[PDB]
Structures are given as C-alpha cells and as structure tokens.
C-alpha cells in the first residue's frame, strides 16, 4: 500500500535500521541454529527493504531524501537520542550496492556453491530483489513527470543494468548449483528474483537462458535414455535403477521449477518483439522447451516426480502464472494440475513463436505429421514422409484466408521466400507437429476414472469391506 | 396506406458554443444578438432543394440525428418544437413553414445577412434580413433549458457566423440592450463551432464513436450558497467578526501591493492605485460596509456546515505574532499593514477541503448579491453596464480566479487559527449529481444482425481514447438497447473503467485501461469461450483463468458490441484492414482467430441506441402492463382497458406511462367559413367526433392526463406536468405592429383530472369512476372536453390538416387504471368514422385490430449511415468571423410512414 514513506519516519527508521543491521550481521555467525532461521530472516529483511523509505545502501545521496530522520530532524535532535551524526555510521557493516553487487558477481564467476555463500542466497539477494525495483522507480530511468523530474535530485542511482546484472548472476549461481541433490533454496530464490526480470534486457536470452535450458534438456535426454534401457531390460533389477532415475527426475524438476518461473516472465515481456521481428534464439528456445515437454509427456516417472516435488514443496505455480496482476495488486488437483504445470505453461507461451516459424501453407503438412505421430512414427520417419509428400504443400489460390496470412508472412521483416527450403520446412513441421500432438494428449488425456475413487461400490458394501 | 419512398438530402446542424438562458437568480444576461452572412449557395445541387436555416435551438430536445426523422427527414432548425428558424420566406417551428413578409422576399442567397435577436424576458425571437425587419416573431416559448445559435444546412452552402468583437464583425448595429453572443463564452472554454449531439466523428486512424455529451442547465448559473440566515453566533465569533474583516482588508491591500498598486485617491484598475492601503483602520467605511457581512458570513457558514468551533487558547486570541512586511519594500504612506504570522499555523488536509467549500460559498454569495444589484456575466468587463467576467458560480469559474480565492480564504482561516479559535471539520458526505437521464446517459453500438456468427474463431479491437465508462464485447442479436450492457444474459462484455466482466451481473476481471489502450475481444465457438486481451496481454480473473467466459451457448449467435458513457470516445476496428490491427499478431493470429471482417468489401454496418422516445405497441407479454380489448355491449361501447399486472407486489414498476392510440384523426384541409336518438341528417352531416377515457375508482385523477398528442411528441418525463408541454406562438403583423395573425403551436393538448376532481381531499379516494370526454370538430379545428357530462372550460384551436392521436398520460395507483372508451354521444360520431374512410358515415362504434394501444419507449435501435456529410469549420478572421462550408452532396432513400408522419 506504499505506506512506508508516511509510516517509517523518525524512530521507526531507527528500529528498522537496528533490525536490518543485526540480521545482516548474522552472516558472520556459523551455527546449526542459524541455518534454519536464515530463510525467515531473509524474508523479513526483503519486506523491510521494499518498505523502508531510505536508501541505506546508497547513503551518500541521503541528503536528497526527505523521508529521512537526518533531513527531517535538527542536529540538536539526533543528539538527545544517541545517533552517529552520520547516516553512514548508522550501521556501516552493511556494504554499499556497488561492493555487494561486485561480490555477487565474483562468487558467480568463481562458481561458489551454496555452502560458500549461504548468507547471500538466503538473506542478501532477497533484500536486493526488494530494494532495486523500489529505487528504480524513484531513480533515473523512471517515468519522469516534468516538475518531479526537474527539481529534487534522485537519491538512488538504480538503473535496469543493476537488475539485469543481478539476474544474470543469479542464473549463474543456479547453474553452478544445478546438479546438487539438495538445493531447497532455489524455490525461494526464484520467488524473490521474479520481480526484477521485467527490466531484463534482450541479450540475457543468448547470454544465459539458452545454455541453461540446453544443459537441462540434455540431462533430461540422458535420464530418459536410462529409463528406456531399464525398460529394455526387465528383471527384479529393473526395480533397481528406477529409484536412481526417479532421483534424477526429482532433482531435474527442482532445477526446472527454479528456472522456468523467471523465463515465463521474460517471455511475457519479449514475446511481442520475438513475434514482430523473428528471433532465431527464441526459436531455438522453443525447440528446447518442446523437447523437454515431449520427454515429460512420454515419461511416466518424470510427471509423477514433478507432481511429488510440487506437492511436498508447496509450490503454488498459480502465483508464478498470475503474478503480474497480483504484483500489481490492482484437493491434490487444486494443489497440482497439468495445466498449472510450468513445463506445459512455458511451452504454450512460446508456441506462437513456433507457429510463426511455420508458414500458413505448411498447415496441411502439419496435420499429416500429427497423424503420423499418432501412428507413433519417429522424427526421421515423419521427416522423410513429409519430404516425399512435400508437393502437397497448401496453395493460397484455393482459399482467400491463406492470401492475407501469406501477405502477413511477407510483411514480417525476417522472412524471405527464397530462404524457405524443403529441409527447413520438414524440420519445422516435425517440431511443431510433435509439440501440438503431445499437447493435445495432455489437454484431453481421458486419464480420468483410470483408478476410480468415487468408491460407490464401497459405500454400498461399506460394512462388508470392514 | 402503402409506404412511400423518395430521395432526400442529408442535413446537418452547426452551432457556436454559446449557451444562454433565463432562471431565477441567474447571473446571465437575457438579450442576445448574432448574425449569419451567406457567401455561396447552390439552390439545386441535387433534385431536392438546398436547405439553409438560421436561428436558435434548445439544448434539451434539439437532437437532429442524421437521415431519418420527422416527416420526410432533413431535420433542421424549426423541424421540432425545440428550434426556431428562418429561411428567408418562412418561419419554421414544429416542422411547419409559416410565410413571413420582408422587403425583397427571397430564399436565402449569397450576400445576405440574417440578424437574429433573442429576448428571454418576453420571451421573443426576432429577425432582420439585410437590415430590414422580418414581419414575424416567435414568442411565448418554453424556457426549460439553454439557447444556442444554430444553422441547419444541406450540401451546397458557405456561411459565416458573426458574433461580435473579434469573433465576427457586425454589418448592422445590434439593437439597444442586445449583447453580442461572443460575450457569453465561458471562462473555462474557448469559442468554437461544433456539431450537436454527435455519435460519430473522424480521427487519425478511423471513425471514433462518441458517447452522450454532458451539458449545462439554466439552473447551473444560479448560485446556491448554503443557508445561514436562521442561526446564532457566539459572542467570541461576533467580536472576532470585525477584526477578521479589517484583517482581510489588509490582506487584500497586501496582495494588491504585490501586484503593484500604490496609494491612490481613486480606485481603478488602469489607475494603478489602491486607496484603502494607508492603515488597516483608515480603510473607508463603505468597503467595511460590504465586507463586514462577508466576514460574518464566513463564521455563519462554518456553523452551518457543521464544523465544531471553540476557543483553544485565549492567550493567543489576545496576543498574536505579527509578521511585518520587509522595510526594504517601500510604500508611499511609509506604513505597511502587518498581518499575522502564517508560519506558526499548520492546516490539515481537511482544512483544505473546508477552504474549497467556503470559497465555493463566498463566491456564490458575492455573485448572487451582485445579481440582486443587477449584475450579469460577460466575457468582457463593463462596470457601467454591470457586466463582469467573474459573475458566474464558482464551479464554472476559471482555475486562476478560483486559486486566488482559495489562497485568500486559506490565509484567512490560518489567521483565525492564529487567533486560536479551534475549528474541527465534520465528516464528508456523499452526493449524486443526476446530470442526465438514465436512458440518455449510455449509448450502445453494435454490428448489424446480418453479420451474426454462429461458428468460428473471431477477433476484433477496441481502442479507448478516454479512460471512463465503456464496455466492449459480444452481444446477442436480440440485445435490448434499454438495458445496460452485461446486466442481462444477452451480453458478455469487459469494462476497463473498473476491471470488470459483465454477464448477468459484474465480476472483477483484468485491469483498467489507460488512454490509448486497445482491448482485443476474441470469441471461439468451437471451444465456446470468450477471451479479452489488453495491448497483447490476456486478461485474467482473480484466478488462473485465461477466459472471461466459458460454456457459452451459441444460440442465435453473437455480434460485436460496445457501450460508451458520457464524455467517452472509442475506436472499434472490426478488421476490414488487417494491417490496422495493432495486437492481432501478438495475440490471435497463431491462435487461429480471424478478424471479424477479414474479407468484407464494405465496412460492417452498425446500429446505435437512439434515445429519442417513440411510441411502440404494448408487448403482449409485458410483465407489468396488460391491455384488454373489451367487446362493445348494448349498454357499453368498445373499449381498451389498461391493467397493472404486478400491482401490490415487490418488483412492481410504478412510473409515468405515456400511451396513445395507433391511429390518428386528421383535420380537414379547408376549415368551414363562419330519448337519446341521433337525428339522421345531423349525425350524417356532422364533423364532430368523440371518445372518452374512464379512470377507474382507486386511480388518482391527479395522476392522469387526457387529450391528444401530435406525431411529434417525444417527451418522456417522469416528473410530468402540463407546464412541461412544448408551446410556441407565431405572430405575424404589418411592417409596424398591426398583428395580422397569432398562432399557438403545441404537440400536446390535454386536460388534468385534478381540474375535474371536486374538492374532496378529505376521503380523497373515490369509489366513483371519472369519465373524461374529448370532442373534436374536424372542420373548425376546435377541441373541447367534458368531465362527467359537464363541459370543461379548456378548449384548443388547431390548424387544418393536423393529425392527432388519442393519448393518456397516467401514473398508476391501482391495478385498474384507465379505459379508452371508443363510443359516441348523441349526434356525435365515434373515432372509427374519422379514422376509417369506409366508416365515415357509420355511427356504430367499433375498434378494428389496427387500432391498438402504444406506449412510449425512450430508446430504439437506429441504423448508422455508411457515409456522413463532410463539414469544414474554421475562423476566417477577426472581421470575417467563423466559416462553415459543406460542398459534397449526400442522399438517402427514405421510407415514410404516413399515419405517423416520420421517415
């Protein structure tokens, strides 16, 4: 409710400073008791940073802030209640934004694991995720009205570059701690990092997102290959190794539910551009998510471990999907649902990219490839099938709709008619058709009543079952 | 009988933004003058003659909509009882042209100047052609609203408004006491030429749909300060009165200094001097004589408004810190009045609201007082004429004056607080404006039913130029214009003023738009879903729902629809040109949705809700009202009886009901130059006809009006009274006086049952039934009434060829209200003989099926023309005035209903 600038002014600032600076001091202490407490401390610290009206990380410019005790009060005050006489001394232990951001970047490039920098992940980064946006609003790059922009200097210096750097460093940290068995901090890091993704620049895609999803996709491919081998060889041993692959699925899904929620926001803020000016990196990311979703639909263990992760870890997923409206504040099925699943949601969001890849004429080939995939043909099989049935491409001369659709295809700057080639068309149709077919299966599985739980017969024979 | 067709030109009306009126206590001058100069006129650009008319019109009722209307269309000045016009040879009112004599009679031609004068006291409207008098005047017309100059024209015209001063230069001197209309432009507005009640304009990307306009009233100019006469003031307030007075004097002096006035023996604005400023005691008494009451009124209003006033610190009330102006600043006198220090005083935000409120009241009191003295408003200041550019109630005032008044008042309040008289503001209270009528508030635009879709995936866009009340979505073909969009089951819409989705009620959905935001409405009839996007982002409920609506039943189908509230502007793109769609590619294309008009050669035809009330047959299934056709007996005549279906029940509808009969009686073209058995010769040669209305016992006659209506009655007034009937008098005389003719014109001719109820307020409810009889002689134009066989004094005289419908206006107080009795008196024919040619000579009363009860319905669907007249408005210059031009012709095929005389 944006009440901080009116509530925390004179002594509430002192109390909030003291709380903030003690909580930051915790970083030095290493103990068993601290470990369990750092999550809640970091959450409280984040909410304090979002609300607290001063910029304690940028004190040198506090002179320009009016919601500060040092400006509001006379120097003859602040002496009756012992104060350092300088904003910097209020608690110097907390570093400035520059130093803190530099330390985060250094750890990320070094490859530090969670154990080396646990204070950061659990306490510091959430605080920045709440600090940087609030002060980006009040600093330069903010929407300037004439007089407000020209009159008082901005206390803060936050720009979109700070947020982009922080997001990149966070992604680097996650990839460095990607394979580890125990990464309970990821779920919280994602929820804290979500807000700052809006300022994310386009270059972040190529710099960070593509390699992450590529590594994760490759791991999923290896695990499903092991699953196929374990099914190929079916013994009492098959019970063994299945535990292993389920563990791999659990850790993998943890990494996915950490990374995707940020990507969804990045897509929602760059889909318009990716569709107006086509982006090859966006298409590659679509291919990645499509492969992952295909593995998800094909594998029984992958899906069930995803569900288990979600239910045990109390992941909302509806928060991640609907946060924009929420942020702006203007039953097992309810807890987890396939449609709520991030794996399906990200793919649905990026599907427009893959359909933009496909020209309108290719729709007939897409339908045929869907039929073949329902016949359970392989990727190379559908490729050669469409290669031999390529002549069958749709013709605009027959229908008027294709005329204006193809006119728009021209209107796209990146598109050139001479660029289209048979191999491109067959590959493109293969990818989009596979994704759409598996998505149809997911949408209308008919999986219901597979294990009836109406238990009507048991309500009838209730005395007999006992 | 058969419908008639002819080709007619489109006619448009243009007015300046000058609005004049008369009301008790109004700050507004009665007499006004303007001129119109003709530059170029094409008599016959088409087969139909060019249309040009000049005159005055009334805001509340002059709604000439393009194309169809009364008579054969071409509605303009004088085609309604709200407008008064002059074409060169005739005076137009009520769609009737009355010849008027002028020297060199001729239809308006180039190099002709029409001088229009309006005197609101009489009231009267007069004309002069090229400096020569027009031997005819409108008078005795209604004053229920504001008057504005207007010219109605077809294509083939160039004209220039001359309003005086800069905004035109008069060619003939205004007559004495008649002000130029340029003096009426309000402080907050600038002079301009505008259409009247437009539902459509052009813009950069395309046509903009326009909602109803918010218009002023003659009462708005009346200042209405809160009453403070009956109160009592505490002794501390009485004593502080004079000190506060002299203090505001010295503050006035200080401000006047900072502007730059020095000591002067004379007060004038050019003189650059301020006498009062010598000492805060030396101020002349007359200034005190004015401002002591002003000071007292401050405190009296503080009491009236409910603010709690006490003493906080008598020590500060006695002793005060005094801020002295800098000795650096110099005065002729050498003494500068030193006011109280403002720094030691702080005011809460509630104090600021109190300041706004007391400024309202102070300005209104001053205004109202000057009005009693005889002052009036005028954009140009003339003190000898008692005209002021500020003599308007505070709300209409300009922000600059307004701000000066807040600052003065807030300094005065801080001065009182320095005196230490504590003031506690009361809690704020809500209020409702009720500016427009509910029917006139909202306009609905929809696609034509031909475009109804029962299958597919369709997309269309709606840009919101305003951020106010507008709703966009999908509607069923039988959508009622009357109901608000989404309240019923016939519409699924989104309202971005609040972030709501409407279908059978409101539910939160999505987020409000900003200016320029585009709402993409998508409908999937394969998945049976409705989707809304805002600038490429799918709006979601307070959940994960991507669909506003689900499980829709296709039924008849769906149509694009939008609703604009007052002061609203939208742009509806149905996708005829796909390139014009800004967010279709971002959302809708890959999803497969197609534009609603992807492969349509011509733009989709639209219909809009027209708030002009028209008479429609009473629905057989109407929940509240039932009409019974009662067969005639030997003792009783044929009858049409009205009953209240839902009387004495919650959900019942009790409101004014305007009813007429479907068929008229028409008066002769040429009027003649001057037991209980009907005599055959008399009854066969008579021209007198009769009907009656029986008001049943339990129905209050005071709530009943009986008589006739002309086919131009469109007045749907809940607060109905015979004073609301439109009336006008056309008077023609010789060059000097010598009135040859005086004709009264009115759309409504009726009698009040309160005039016939014997004085019986005690036991007002009467077991008896009241039978009001109405008689008309179709050869003399004479209309008379009977109460219970007793002749009433009320009589009417109407011109030949007039059409009149039997009419009853009633407010039900009973389940059995009224009975149209279509019978006869001795030697008088019934209405059937007059209505039907075959029965002209048959006295036997009878009610054929065509005769039926029709009820006034405020709103109706009307087709929006595909093309609109292109009108150029400009300011040619200071002397030339404001120029209006229409050069390109437009024609419409008109279908004319003869009995109703509309097209």
PDB file of N, CA, C and O in Angstrom, chain A residues 103-117 121 125 166-183 185-186 189 207-208 211-213 215-216 219 251 254-255 258-259:
ATOM      1  N   UNK A 103      30.596  -8.423  -5.223  1.00  0.00           N
ATOM      2  CA  UNK A 103      30.823  -9.689  -4.532  1.00  0.00           C
ATOM      3  C   UNK A 103      29.953 -10.788  -5.124  1.00  0.00           C
ATOM      4  O   UNK A 103      30.406 -11.923  -5.311  1.00  0.00           O
ATOM      5  N   UNK A 104      28.689 -10.471  -5.414  1.00  0.00           N
ATOM      6  CA  UNK A 104      27.803 -11.468  -6.009  1.00  0.00           C
ATOM      7  C   UNK A 104      28.356 -11.929  -7.352  1.00  0.00           C
ATOM      8  O   UNK A 104      28.409 -13.133  -7.643  1.00  0.00           O
ATOM      9  N   UNK A 105      28.774 -10.980  -8.191  1.00  0.00           N
ATOM     10  CA  UNK A 105      29.325 -11.349  -9.487  1.00  0.00           C
ATOM     11  C   UNK A 105      30.588 -12.179  -9.360  1.00  0.00           C
ATOM     12  O   UNK A 105      30.800 -13.136 -10.112  1.00  0.00           O
ATOM     13  N   UNK A 106      31.448 -11.819  -8.408  1.00  0.00           N
ATOM     14  CA  UNK A 106      32.665 -12.582  -8.195  1.00  0.00           C
ATOM     15  C   UNK A 106      32.383 -14.009  -7.773  1.00  0.00           C
ATOM     16  O   UNK A 106      32.998 -14.949  -8.280  1.00  0.00           O
ATOM     17  N   UNK A 107      31.442 -14.194  -6.846  1.00  0.00           N
ATOM     18  CA  UNK A 107      31.073 -15.549  -6.450  1.00  0.00           C
ATOM     19  C   UNK A 107      30.510 -16.329  -7.630  1.00  0.00           C
ATOM     20  O   UNK A 107      30.871 -17.493  -7.845  1.00  0.00           O
ATOM     21  N   UNK A 108      29.630 -15.700  -8.413  1.00  0.00           N
ATOM     22  CA  UNK A 108      29.021 -16.399  -9.538  1.00  0.00           C
ATOM     23  C   UNK A 108      30.071 -16.837 -10.551  1.00  0.00           C
ATOM     24  O   UNK A 108      30.053 -17.982 -11.018  1.00  0.00           O
ATOM     25  N   UNK A 109      30.997 -15.942 -10.903  1.00  0.00           N
ATOM     26  CA  UNK A 109      32.027 -16.303 -11.873  1.00  0.00           C
ATOM     27  C   UNK A 109      33.001 -17.320 -11.289  1.00  0.00           C
ATOM     28  O   UNK A 109      33.561 -18.144 -12.021  1.00  0.00           O
ATOM     29  N   UNK A 110      33.218 -17.280  -9.971  1.00  0.00           N
ATOM     30  CA  UNK A 110      34.086 -18.267  -9.339  1.00  0.00           C
ATOM     31  C   UNK A 110      33.451 -19.650  -9.363  1.00  0.00           C
ATOM     32  O   UNK A 110      34.155 -20.664  -9.436  1.00  0.00           O
ATOM     33  N   UNK A 111      32.124 -19.711  -9.301  1.00  0.00           N
ATOM     34  CA  UNK A 111      31.440 -20.983  -9.214  1.00  0.00           C
ATOM     35  C   UNK A 111      31.158 -21.430  -7.802  1.00  0.00           C
ATOM     36  O   UNK A 111      31.014 -22.635  -7.560  1.00  0.00           O
ATOM     37  N   UNK A 112      31.078 -20.498  -6.857  1.00  0.00           N
ATOM     38  CA  UNK A 112      30.868 -20.850  -5.461  1.00  0.00           C
ATOM     39  C   UNK A 112      29.569 -21.626  -5.294  1.00  0.00           C
ATOM     40  O   UNK A 112      28.541 -21.274  -5.882  1.00  0.00           O
ATOM     41  N   UNK A 113      29.619 -22.683  -4.491  1.00  0.00           N
ATOM     42  CA  UNK A 113      28.425 -23.444  -4.173  1.00  0.00           C
ATOM     43  C   UNK A 113      27.646 -22.746  -3.058  1.00  0.00           C
ATOM     44  O   UNK A 113      28.066 -21.723  -2.513  1.00  0.00           O
ATOM     45  N   UNK A 114      26.487 -23.317  -2.724  1.00  0.00           N
ATOM     46  CA  UNK A 114      25.644 -22.723  -1.691  1.00  0.00           C
ATOM     47  C   UNK A 114      26.376 -22.651  -0.356  1.00  0.00           C
ATOM     48  O   UNK A 114      26.156 -21.724   0.433  1.00  0.00           O
ATOM     49  N   UNK A 115      27.251 -23.621  -0.089  1.00  0.00           N
ATOM     50  CA  UNK A 115      27.933 -23.682   1.202  1.00  0.00           C
ATOM     51  C   UNK A 115      28.901 -22.520   1.385  1.00  0.00           C
ATOM     52  O   UNK A 115      29.117 -22.053   2.509  1.00  0.00           O
ATOM     53  N   UNK A 116      29.515 -22.057   0.295  1.00  0.00           N
ATOM     54  CA  UNK A 116      30.469 -20.957   0.396  1.00  0.00           C
ATOM     55  C   UNK A 116      29.764 -19.628   0.628  1.00  0.00           C
ATOM     56  O   UNK A 116      30.292 -18.750   1.322  1.00  0.00           O
ATOM     57  N   UNK A 117      28.576 -19.462   0.057  1.00  0.00           N
ATOM     58  CA  UNK A 117      27.847 -18.195   0.069  1.00  0.00           C
ATOM     59  C   UNK A 117      26.389 -18.437   0.450  1.00  0.00           C
ATOM     60  O   UNK A 117      25.460 -18.002  -0.238  1.00  0.00           O
ATOM     61  N   UNK A 121      22.543 -16.157  -0.505  1.00  0.00           N
ATOM     62  CA  UNK A 121      21.350 -16.720  -1.136  1.00  0.00           C
ATOM     63  C   UNK A 121      20.128 -16.532  -0.249  1.00  0.00           C
ATOM     64  O   UNK A 121      19.041 -16.196  -0.734  1.00  0.00           O
ATOM     65  N   UNK A 125      20.360 -11.604  -1.249  1.00  0.00           N
ATOM     66  CA  UNK A 125      19.724 -11.473  -2.559  1.00  0.00           C
ATOM     67  C   UNK A 125      18.243 -11.146  -2.451  1.00  0.00           C
ATOM     68  O   UNK A 125      17.754 -10.304  -3.223  1.00  0.00           O
ATOM     69  N   UNK A 166      22.167  -8.485 -11.766  1.00  0.00           N
ATOM     70  CA  UNK A 166      21.781  -9.343 -10.651  1.00  0.00           C
ATOM     71  C   UNK A 166      21.106 -10.612 -11.154  1.00  0.00           C
ATOM     72  O   UNK A 166      21.369 -11.711 -10.653  1.00  0.00           O
ATOM     73  N   UNK A 167      20.222 -10.475 -12.142  1.00  0.00           N
ATOM     74  CA  UNK A 167      19.535 -11.638 -12.690  1.00  0.00           C
ATOM     75  C   UNK A 167      20.521 -12.600 -13.338  1.00  0.00           C
ATOM     76  O   UNK A 167      20.438 -13.821 -13.147  1.00  0.00           O
ATOM     77  N   UNK A 168      21.464 -12.066 -14.115  1.00  0.00           N
ATOM     78  CA  UNK A 168      22.469 -12.919 -14.726  1.00  0.00           C
ATOM     79  C   UNK A 168      23.305 -13.649 -13.694  1.00  0.00           C
ATOM     80  O   UNK A 168      23.587 -14.842 -13.837  1.00  0.00           O
ATOM     81  N   UNK A 169      23.705 -12.945 -12.634  1.00  0.00           N
ATOM     82  CA  UNK A 169      24.490 -13.579 -11.581  1.00  0.00           C
ATOM     83  C   UNK A 169      23.683 -14.658 -10.869  1.00  0.00           C
ATOM     84  O   UNK A 169      24.220 -15.713 -10.515  1.00  0.00           O
ATOM     85  N   UNK A 170      22.392 -14.411 -10.649  1.00  0.00           N
ATOM     86  CA  UNK A 170      21.535 -15.408 -10.011  1.00  0.00           C
ATOM     87  C   UNK A 170      21.446 -16.659 -10.877  1.00  0.00           C
ATOM     88  O   UNK A 170      21.528 -17.793 -10.383  1.00  0.00           O
ATOM     89  N   UNK A 171      21.258 -16.470 -12.183  1.00  0.00           N
ATOM     90  CA  UNK A 171      21.195 -17.606 -13.095  1.00  0.00           C
ATOM     91  C   UNK A 171      22.509 -18.375 -13.082  1.00  0.00           C
ATOM     92  O   UNK A 171      22.528 -19.614 -13.110  1.00  0.00           O
ATOM     93  N   UNK A 172      23.624 -17.645 -13.045  1.00  0.00           N
ATOM     94  CA  UNK A 172      24.934 -18.280 -12.971  1.00  0.00           C
ATOM     95  C   UNK A 172      25.067 -19.105 -11.695  1.00  0.00           C
ATOM     96  O   UNK A 172      25.599 -20.222 -11.715  1.00  0.00           O
ATOM     97  N   UNK A 173      24.577 -18.571 -10.576  1.00  0.00           N
ATOM     98  CA  UNK A 173      24.613 -19.306  -9.314  1.00  0.00           C
ATOM     99  C   UNK A 173      23.808 -20.592  -9.426  1.00  0.00           C
ATOM    100  O   UNK A 173      24.242 -21.662  -8.982  1.00  0.00           O
ATOM    101  N   UNK A 174      22.612 -20.503 -10.008  1.00  0.00           N
ATOM    102  CA  UNK A 174      21.769 -21.690 -10.121  1.00  0.00           C
ATOM    103  C   UNK A 174      22.447 -22.746 -10.983  1.00  0.00           C
ATOM    104  O   UNK A 174      22.455 -23.933 -10.640  1.00  0.00           O
ATOM    105  N   UNK A 175      23.025 -22.339 -12.115  1.00  0.00           N
ATOM    106  CA  UNK A 175      23.671 -23.323 -12.979  1.00  0.00           C
ATOM    107  C   UNK A 175      24.877 -23.937 -12.279  1.00  0.00           C
ATOM    108  O   UNK A 175      25.159 -25.131 -12.439  1.00  0.00           O
ATOM    109  N   UNK A 176      25.608 -23.141 -11.495  1.00  0.00           N
ATOM    110  CA  UNK A 176      26.724 -23.695 -10.735  1.00  0.00           C
ATOM    111  C   UNK A 176      26.246 -24.705  -9.702  1.00  0.00           C
ATOM    112  O   UNK A 176      26.926 -25.706  -9.451  1.00  0.00           O
ATOM    113  N   UNK A 177      25.085 -24.460  -9.092  1.00  0.00           N
ATOM    114  CA  UNK A 177      24.493 -25.380  -8.126  1.00  0.00           C
ATOM    115  C   UNK A 177      23.369 -26.200  -8.750  1.00  0.00           C
ATOM    116  O   UNK A 177      22.371 -26.491  -8.085  1.00  0.00           O
ATOM    117  N   UNK A 178      23.506 -26.558 -10.026  1.00  0.00           N
ATOM    118  CA  UNK A 178      22.388 -27.140 -10.762  1.00  0.00           C
ATOM    119  C   UNK A 178      22.175 -28.608 -10.403  1.00  0.00           C
ATOM    120  O   UNK A 178      21.041 -29.031 -10.146  1.00  0.00           O
ATOM    121  N   UNK A 179      23.247 -29.400 -10.381  1.00  0.00           N
ATOM    122  CA  UNK A 179      23.085 -30.841 -10.256  1.00  0.00           C
ATOM    123  C   UNK A 179      22.928 -31.319  -8.824  1.00  0.00           C
ATOM    124  O   UNK A 179      22.464 -32.436  -8.585  1.00  0.00           O
ATOM    125  N   UNK A 180      23.311 -30.488  -7.855  1.00  0.00           N
ATOM    126  CA  UNK A 180      23.354 -30.895  -6.452  1.00  0.00           C
ATOM    127  C   UNK A 180      22.027 -31.505  -6.017  1.00  0.00           C
ATOM    128  O   UNK A 180      20.956 -31.100  -6.484  1.00  0.00           O
ATOM    129  N   UNK A 181      22.100 -32.485  -5.115  1.00  0.00           N
ATOM    130  CA  UNK A 181      20.900 -33.183  -4.665  1.00  0.00           C
ATOM    131  C   UNK A 181      20.005 -32.281  -3.822  1.00  0.00           C
ATOM    132  O   UNK A 181      18.776 -32.329  -3.947  1.00  0.00           O
ATOM    133  N   UNK A 182      20.596 -31.456  -2.960  1.00  0.00           N
ATOM    134  CA  UNK A 182      19.851 -30.634  -2.010  1.00  0.00           C
ATOM    135  C   UNK A 182      20.031 -29.167  -2.361  1.00  0.00           C
ATOM    136  O   UNK A 182      21.102 -28.597  -2.130  1.00  0.00           O
ATOM    137  N   UNK A 183      18.987 -28.562  -2.917  1.00  0.00           N
ATOM    138  CA  UNK A 183      19.001 -27.154  -3.283  1.00  0.00           C
ATOM    139  C   UNK A 183      17.678 -26.506  -2.883  1.00  0.00           C
ATOM    140  O   UNK A 183      17.020 -25.819  -3.663  1.00  0.00           O
ATOM    141  N   UNK A 185      17.000 -24.001  -1.449  1.00  0.00           N
ATOM    142  CA  UNK A 185      16.974 -22.542  -1.524  1.00  0.00           C
ATOM    143  C   UNK A 185      16.434 -22.043  -2.863  1.00  0.00           C
ATOM    144  O   UNK A 185      16.055 -20.870  -2.985  1.00  0.00           O
ATOM    145  N   UNK A 186      16.408 -22.907  -3.881  1.00  0.00           N
ATOM    146  CA  UNK A 186      16.054 -22.467  -5.227  1.00  0.00           C
ATOM    147  C   UNK A 186      14.628 -21.930  -5.299  1.00  0.00           C
ATOM    148  O   UNK A 186      14.360 -20.928  -5.972  1.00  0.00           O
ATOM    149  N   UNK A 189      14.647 -18.471  -3.955  1.00  0.00           N
ATOM    150  CA  UNK A 189      15.408 -17.564  -4.800  1.00  0.00           C
ATOM    151  C   UNK A 189      14.597 -17.174  -6.027  1.00  0.00           C
ATOM    152  O   UNK A 189      14.637 -16.021  -6.467  1.00  0.00           O
ATOM    153  N   UNK A 207      22.838 -14.786 -23.632  1.00  0.00           N
ATOM    154  CA  UNK A 207      23.933 -14.863 -22.670  1.00  0.00           C
ATOM    155  C   UNK A 207      23.741 -16.019 -21.694  1.00  0.00           C
ATOM    156  O   UNK A 207      24.676 -16.785 -21.438  1.00  0.00           O
ATOM    157  N   UNK A 208      22.536 -16.165 -21.140  1.00  0.00           N
ATOM    158  CA  UNK A 208      22.307 -17.068 -20.018  1.00  0.00           C
ATOM    159  C   UNK A 208      21.270 -18.140 -20.325  1.00  0.00           C
ATOM    160  O   UNK A 208      21.509 -19.318 -20.043  1.00  0.00           O
ATOM    161  N   UNK A 211      21.997 -21.519 -22.853  1.00  0.00           N
ATOM    162  CA  UNK A 211      22.839 -22.592 -22.295  1.00  0.00           C
ATOM    163  C   UNK A 211      22.196 -23.335 -21.138  1.00  0.00           C
ATOM    164  O   UNK A 211      22.346 -24.558 -21.034  1.00  0.00           O
ATOM    165  N   UNK A 212      21.484 -22.628 -20.259  1.00  0.00           N
ATOM    166  CA  UNK A 212      20.871 -23.284 -19.108  1.00  0.00           C
ATOM    167  C   UNK A 212      19.871 -24.335 -19.560  1.00  0.00           C
ATOM    168  O   UNK A 212      19.939 -25.506 -19.157  1.00  0.00           O
ATOM    169  N   UNK A 213      18.934 -23.926 -20.417  1.00  0.00           N
ATOM    170  CA  UNK A 213      17.902 -24.838 -20.882  1.00  0.00           C
ATOM    171  C   UNK A 213      18.520 -25.939 -21.727  1.00  0.00           C
ATOM    172  O   UNK A 213      18.035 -27.072 -21.725  1.00  0.00           O
ATOM    173  N   UNK A 215      21.594 -27.353 -21.298  1.00  0.00           N
ATOM    174  CA  UNK A 215      22.148 -28.326 -20.361  1.00  0.00           C
ATOM    175  C   UNK A 215      21.042 -29.148 -19.718  1.00  0.00           C
ATOM    176  O   UNK A 215      21.151 -30.375 -19.592  1.00  0.00           O
ATOM    177  N   UNK A 216      19.969 -28.478 -19.299  1.00  0.00           N
ATOM    178  CA  UNK A 216      18.891 -29.164 -18.599  1.00  0.00           C
ATOM    179  C   UNK A 216      18.172 -30.142 -19.526  1.00  0.00           C
ATOM    180  O   UNK A 216      17.844 -31.270 -19.132  1.00  0.00           O
ATOM    181  N   UNK A 219      20.380 -33.193 -19.937  1.00  0.00           N
ATOM    182  CA  UNK A 219      20.251 -34.074 -18.781  1.00  0.00           C
ATOM    183  C   UNK A 219      18.958 -34.876 -18.849  1.00  0.00           C
ATOM    184  O   UNK A 219      18.946 -36.082 -18.566  1.00  0.00           O
ATOM    185  N   UNK A 251      15.539 -34.143  -8.861  1.00  0.00           N
ATOM    186  CA  UNK A 251      16.486 -33.028  -8.857  1.00  0.00           C
ATOM    187  C   UNK A 251      16.316 -32.183 -10.118  1.00  0.00           C
ATOM    188  O   UNK A 251      16.378 -30.943 -10.078  1.00  0.00           O
ATOM    189  N   UNK A 254      13.313 -30.038  -9.805  1.00  0.00           N
ATOM    190  CA  UNK A 254      13.619 -28.936  -8.900  1.00  0.00           C
ATOM    191  C   UNK A 254      14.319 -27.811  -9.651  1.00  0.00           C
ATOM    192  O   UNK A 254      13.934 -26.637  -9.547  1.00  0.00           O
ATOM    193  N   UNK A 255      15.338 -28.159 -10.440  1.00  0.00           N
ATOM    194  CA  UNK A 255      16.025 -27.148 -11.238  1.00  0.00           C
ATOM    195  C   UNK A 255      15.064 -26.462 -12.208  1.00  0.00           C
ATOM    196  O   UNK A 255      15.125 -25.240 -12.399  1.00  0.00           O
ATOM    197  N   UNK A 258      12.802 -24.082 -10.528  1.00  0.00           N
ATOM    198  CA  UNK A 258      13.570 -22.897 -10.169  1.00  0.00           C
ATOM    199  C   UNK A 258      13.730 -21.953 -11.356  1.00  0.00           C
ATOM    200  O   UNK A 258      13.527 -20.740 -11.228  1.00  0.00           O
ATOM    201  N   UNK A 259      14.090 -22.495 -12.523  1.00  0.00           N
ATOM    202  CA  UNK A 259      14.491 -21.641 -13.641  1.00  0.00           C
ATOM    203  C   UNK A 259      13.292 -21.131 -14.434  1.00  0.00           C
ATOM    204  O   UNK A 259      13.210 -19.936 -14.741  1.00  0.00           O
TER     205      UNK A 259
END
